[PDB]
């Protein structure tokens, strides 16, 4: 009578697959057939923030679009002016083992985790005129893969447990608890209006967690390895994930469908990171083949590569304005380029 | 005059093979720039020297010829006085650049637990630009005193006077040469001295630096028998040229026979050289 | 034109510039190790002089008359996590530890050192094999035979050709024989010498590493 | 907690000379620059001197150019100037101010209690020409502030900060870059403004809005003053 | 066992299922139409004189 139970999933998934394959009168593909491709995105290296030590694992642009983070294995998270190349700080770590960073949308606190297995945030502004860890969240059993602020109060982590938290700074208390995962986190994504978030995972699958409620609203499989990157679309009804399959895939929230694959024969390496511009038409994608790919989003096509690193590009961002696009490889160099 | 013919074919040989080996050095540390494959520190000095040897070896060709189509010119006291300043600007240069390579060399590759030789490695790359400046005030020195002594020959067309000019231009070249030497009888030893400390935890590299031991050993022979015959004739001018465009030419061959990329580039070369032939 | 106040930011930067590369310095003259081998290698007590400095990343610390090495257990079974792999790449070398008188696991230690050895970032790392328990292997070698597990077997069956024939079949799995260097060591636990043996190996890579550098091979 | 201690201040004959010390103790003092800043017995504020993090830059005002030296020992967290051939002029408050310089920054956002020092018997000129105001509780006042030179710098910073001296207390920073709220202060206070023309306006003056409003500029050294806006009831 | 487990997959299974759905083709309008609306406002799509852009090369 047990296996009467698993009918019932199996059933579940028929249903799903049967919905998602009635859904797709058309391809986007198809529907962006008649549309003015972007060219060739011709960028430079505008300027090549070099203070890093060892290989930079993490980024993130301050919600100025002037000021970035960025952590490093050499126990470093440094902040830059990226104008000037200036280093506004330049944060010890207790533990050099920092896989993850982001900057608080305020900019009034910063956040790092790793196989310490603990976010620490530290405050950058403080009357005593230094930076120190003002909290230290706690309880997660594995390495944080990647962690977003939604304020100065709410932070979402995930971690390599298979599972995500999102933690209340000031209680230092995993507020909510997002379960169901089979594989380890390897990535997260706050939706623009911070109410639901997206995280992908190493088993293949990437699943769109609601923030107030603490449920898996939908879940998307199309990968065929570890989602190592993902990124919303601008709107915020879309998404973006990377995968070491050599092969990204847009898809869409409402359709519970993907969408769209990017994906090339001479390219093998495995995505590092994803990012989306202003207007959501260009996904930059940041591989292991030490080279950075501008695909055009409706349209995969390849438009542009932001070649200037000698090793893999670990890191990837996009300013909110738009107006520059940051690449930090393992080289221990950040490039901008416009 | 078994001299005065024989030493026109060993110029002319040290011509030929100095401009194939440092004009072969720059090409192969060049193409990188465009292919954009990476050079390293070693490479940009080796760029630096061969572009440098291949000035100073051209000098003294331009030296020579100046000297056997139209000697008229040539004994001049203009002439005479800047082809000296500028053989001795470009030679200084071309030594020291050779030394900072050997400092390069000492610094990264030994192994000495020395505090004072610890922090030399960690800024190697900015001792090789402090040493450029006071071998730059050696330089200055050097021009002081090569320039004294044509003043003091011309007051008195060098009417045979330039066995002093030929003394002191063999110094600041041994200085550098024994700083390098000394570089390298420590590189050496502490190479022994770890593989002699490798009991049981490629001849190729053997007989490299053999090569290196070799050529140094010769040079060294050669310019001190040069420098004392000196000390104690009509012939005596195109033996010193042949002398002075020797390190230049001979030493690149050494330096291709040291870091792999010559190497490699240079056998590639005559691959392709035997493909083209049959 | 730059004003009073971006100059101000400037000479801040180059400070915070020259704190990192003090630091920088400081680090320098200090070796980063990988340790790894099966749970009863001997992974826990393979320098006998050391003190223990989240989850795994047992971290520990020693010298040698210039050098402080800083070995990072990584705990069972994660040496294929691929996750916190990618990290330890700037170590200097591996510090794989196996077990000679562990016939019955013996393959699983091969296996694991197979997934090291030719693991794609771990693919220049020099290993530095430490075949403990020489000890008890001496008694083992000479009461049960290697050929139980082994397929070849030992031709005479003794200490030293069967010893040998392990540290061999260790070093057959090492494909990239040009590219990395594998050191091998016959401990006996009650030995002060392997701290000797890692600073040797790791001086001689060292060296191997800043002669590559220099171009010279 | 901040606090800066001023010591060292006394009666000094005219040609002697002078250490006067400030101990800076709450914060990392190795990261911050200093000032040192006097205040006549009836005058304005005027910048004396400026030290640099980590001692690299230093820089002094003109009228005190050869004769005050500065200088900072980190380990012992303290700030020296040492005066020599003190003329009557030099008679005044001297205070040791804090500034760190970085985006984002509020430069001379703390002040220390100054220390009286009395002797016994190309610049950008900025004009505050409203000494008196006279306002009561509940209103609204808006003191102005001039400058002969331009303080918009082409990076789109403008280099206007305004304190408050208030009775018997040392100067508070209000606005920072003449748009840039400084921590703990009031939301009434508002400075706004545009190329040589300034304005900080108070909404509604509370109890604690009593005392002198200083303009000053930043765009370049030396640092100079306003005249001082004096809010009385 | 962990049959109970397997119910609560099931569970979520049931809750997933069950949600509002629009057809590929009108998310594929959206995205284009979001993708068109912002165009003049994405300074990587279309690059902005030098004058408005602030990583601008410093002038040699
Ligand atoms: O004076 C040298 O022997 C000489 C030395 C170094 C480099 C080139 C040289 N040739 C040279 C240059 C100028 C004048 C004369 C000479 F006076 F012998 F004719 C020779
Ligand atoms: O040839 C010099 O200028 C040199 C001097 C000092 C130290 C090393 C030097 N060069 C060098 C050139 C080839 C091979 C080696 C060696 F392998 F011995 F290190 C060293």
Redesign the interface.
């Known amino acids: 009578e047990?296996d009467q139970?698993?009918q019932?999933?199996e059933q579940?998934?028929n249903?799903?697959r049967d919905?998602?394959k009635a859904?797709?009168?058309?391809?986007?593909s198809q529907?962006?057939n008649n549309?003015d491709p972007?060219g060739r995105?011709q960028?430079?290296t505008?300027?090549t923030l070099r203070?890093h030590?060892?290989?930079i694992y993490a980024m993130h642009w301050g919600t100025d679009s002037?000021?970035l983070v960025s952590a490093s294995?050499?126990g470093?998270l440094?902040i830059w002016?990226?104008?000037?190349?200036?280093?506004?700080?330049?944060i010890?770590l207790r533990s050099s083992?920092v896989?993850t960073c982001a900057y608080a949308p305020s900019?009034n606190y910063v956040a790092c985790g790793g196989?310490?297995?603990?976010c620490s945030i530290y405050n950058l502004?403080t009357?005593?005129?230094?930076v120190r860890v003002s909290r230290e969240l706690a309880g997660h059993?594995?390495?944080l893969?990647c962690c977003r602020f939604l304020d100065d109060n709410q932070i979402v982590t995930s971690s390599?447990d298979t599972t995500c938290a999102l933690w209340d700074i000031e209680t230092g208390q995993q507020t909510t608890t997002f379960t169901?995962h089979t594989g380890?986190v390897?990535s997260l994504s706050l939706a623009p209006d911070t109410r639901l978030f997206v995280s992908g995972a190493c088993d293949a699958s990437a699943k769109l967690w609601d923030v107030r409620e603490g449920?898996?609203?939908?879940?998307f499989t199309g990968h065929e390895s570890?989602i190592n990157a993902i990124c919303f679309?601008?709107?915020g009804?879309?998404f973006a994930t990377g995968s070491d399959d050599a092969t990204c895939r847009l898809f869409?929230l409402?359709?519970?469908?993907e969408?769209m694959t990017y994906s090339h024969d001479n390219i093998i390496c495995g995505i590092t990171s994803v990012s989306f511009?202003?207007?959501?038409?260009?996904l930059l994608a940041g591989y292991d083949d030490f080279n950075c790919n501008?695909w055009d989003?409706?349209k995969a096509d390849r438009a542009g590569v932001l070649a200037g690193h000698?090793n893999r590009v670990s890191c990837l961002g996009?300013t909110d304005?738009?107006?520059?696009?940051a690449t930090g490889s393992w080289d221990s160099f950040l490039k901008?380029w416009? | 005059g078994v001299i005065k013919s024989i030493f026109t074919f060993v110029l002319i040989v040290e011509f030929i093979i100095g401009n194939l080996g440092n004009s072969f050095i720059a090409l192969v540390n060049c193409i990188d720039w465009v292919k954009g494959r990476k050079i390293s520190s070693v490479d940009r000095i080796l760029t630096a020297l061969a572009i440098s040897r291949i000035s100073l070896v051209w000098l003294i060709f331009g030296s020579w010829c100046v000297s056997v189509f139209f000697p008229a010119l040539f004994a001049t006291e203009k002439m005479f006085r800047m082809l000296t300043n500028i053989w001795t600007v470009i030679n200084h240069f071309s030594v020291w650049l050779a030394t900072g390579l050997g400092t390069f060399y000492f610094l990264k590759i030994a192994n000495f637990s020395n505090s004072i030789f610890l922090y030399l490695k960690w800024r190697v790359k900015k001792v090789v630009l402090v040493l450029l400046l006071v071998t730059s005030v050696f330089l200055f020195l050097n021009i002081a005193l090569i320039n004294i002594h044509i003043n003091a020959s011309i007051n008195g067309n060098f009417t045979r006077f330039s066995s002093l000019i030929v003394l002191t231009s063999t110094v600041f070249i041994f200085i550098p040469f024994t700083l390098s030497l000394a570089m390298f009888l420590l590189l050496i030893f502490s190479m022994w001295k770890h593989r002699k400390k490798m009991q049981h935890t490629s001849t190729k590299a053997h007989r490299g630096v053999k090569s290196v031991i070799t050529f140094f050993l010769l040079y060294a022979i050669f310019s001190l028998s040069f420098f004392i015959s000196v000390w104690t004739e009509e012939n005596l001018i195109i033996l010193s040229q042949v002398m002075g465009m020797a390190y230049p030419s001979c030493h690149s061959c050494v330096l291709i026979l040291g870091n792999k990329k010559l190497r490699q580039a240079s056998l590639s070369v005559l691959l392709w050289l035997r493909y083209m032939f049959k | 034109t730059v004003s009073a106040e971006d100059k101000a930011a400037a000479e801040r930067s180059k400070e915070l510039e020259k704190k990192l590369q003090e630091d920088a310095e400081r680090d320098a003259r200090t070796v980063k190790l990988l340790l790894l081998g099966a749970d009863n290698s001997g992974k826990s007590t393979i320098v006998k002089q050391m003190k223990i400095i989240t989850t795994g990343i047992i971290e520990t610390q020693f010298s040698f008359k210039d050098l402080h090495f800083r070995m990072f257990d990584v705990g069972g079974q994660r040496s294929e996590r691929k996750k916190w792999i990618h990290c330890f790449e700037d170590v200097t070398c591996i510090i794989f530890c196996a077990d000679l008188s562990d016939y019955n696991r013996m393959h699983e230690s091969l296996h694991l050192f197979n997934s090291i050895c030719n693991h794609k970032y771990f693919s220049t790392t020099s290993i530095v094999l430490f075949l403990n328990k020489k000890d008890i292997f001496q008694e083992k070698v000479t009461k049960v035979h290697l050929s139980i597990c082994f397929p070849e077997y030992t031709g005479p069956n003794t200490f030293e050709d069967a010893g040998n024939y392990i540290k061999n079949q260790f070093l057959d799995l090492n494909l990239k024989k040009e590219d990395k260097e594998i050191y091998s060591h016959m401990t006996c636990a009650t030995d002060t010498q392997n701290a000797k043996f890692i600073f040797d190996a790791v001086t001689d890579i060292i060296i191997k590493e800043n002669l590559k550098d220099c171009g010279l091979f | 907690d901040v606090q800066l201690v001023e010591s060292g201040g006394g009666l000094v004959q005219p040609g002697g000379s002078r250490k006067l010390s400030c101990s800076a103790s709450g914060f990392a003092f190795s990261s911050f620059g200093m000032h040192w800043v006097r205040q006549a017995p009836e005058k304005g504020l005027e910048w004396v001197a400026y030290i640099s993090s980590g001692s690299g830059t230093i820089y002094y005002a003109d009228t005190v150019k050869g004769r005050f030296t500065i200088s900072r020992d980190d380990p012992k967290n303290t700030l020296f100037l040492q005066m020599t051939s003190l003329r009557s002029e030099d008679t005044a408050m001297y205070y040791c101010v804090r500034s760190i310089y970085y985006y984002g920054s509020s430069p001379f956002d703390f002040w220390g209690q100054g220390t009286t020092l009395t002797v016994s018997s190309s610049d950008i000129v900025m004009t505050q020409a409203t000494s008196s105001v006279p306002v009561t509780p509940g209103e609204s006042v808006s003191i102005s502030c001039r400058s002969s030179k331009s303080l918009l710098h082409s990076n789109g910073n403008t280099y206007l900060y305004w304190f408050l001296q208030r009775p018997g207390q040392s100067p508070q920073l209000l606005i920072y870059r003449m748009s840039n709220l400084a921590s703990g202060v009031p939301d009434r206070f508002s400075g706004s403004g545009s190329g040589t023309a300034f304005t900080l306006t108070i909404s509604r003056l509370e109890a604690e809005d009593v005392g002198v409003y200083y303009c000053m500029q930043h765009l370049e050294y030396p640092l100079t003053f306003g005249a001082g806006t004096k809010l009385e009831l | 066992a962990s049959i109970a487990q397997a119910r609560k997959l099931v569970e979520q299974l049931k809750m997933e299922a069950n949600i509002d759905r629009i057809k590929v083709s009108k998310a594929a309008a959206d995205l284009m139409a979001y993708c068109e609306a912002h165009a003049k406002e994405d300074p990587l799509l279309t690059p902005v004189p030098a004058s408005e852009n602030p990583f601008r090369e410093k002038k040699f």
């Not at chain 1, 002016?81 to 330049?90: E, G, I, L």
């Not at chain 1, 009357?127 to 230094?130: A, I, K, L, P, S």
């Open positions: 047990l139970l698993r019932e999933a579940l998934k249903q799903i919905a998602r859904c797709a009168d058309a391809t986007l529907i962006t549309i972007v995105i960028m430079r505008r300027r203070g030590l060892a290989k002037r000021l294995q050499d470093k440094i002016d990226s104008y000037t190349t200036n280093k506004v700080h330049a010890p083992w896989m900019g196989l310490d297995n603990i502004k009357r005593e005129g230094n059993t594995g390495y893969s390599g169901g380890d390897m449920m898996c609203r939908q879940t570890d679309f601008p709107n009804n879309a869409d409402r359709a519970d469908q969408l511009s202003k207007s959501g038409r260009l501008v989003a409706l000698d996009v304005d738009g107006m520059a696009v901008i416009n």
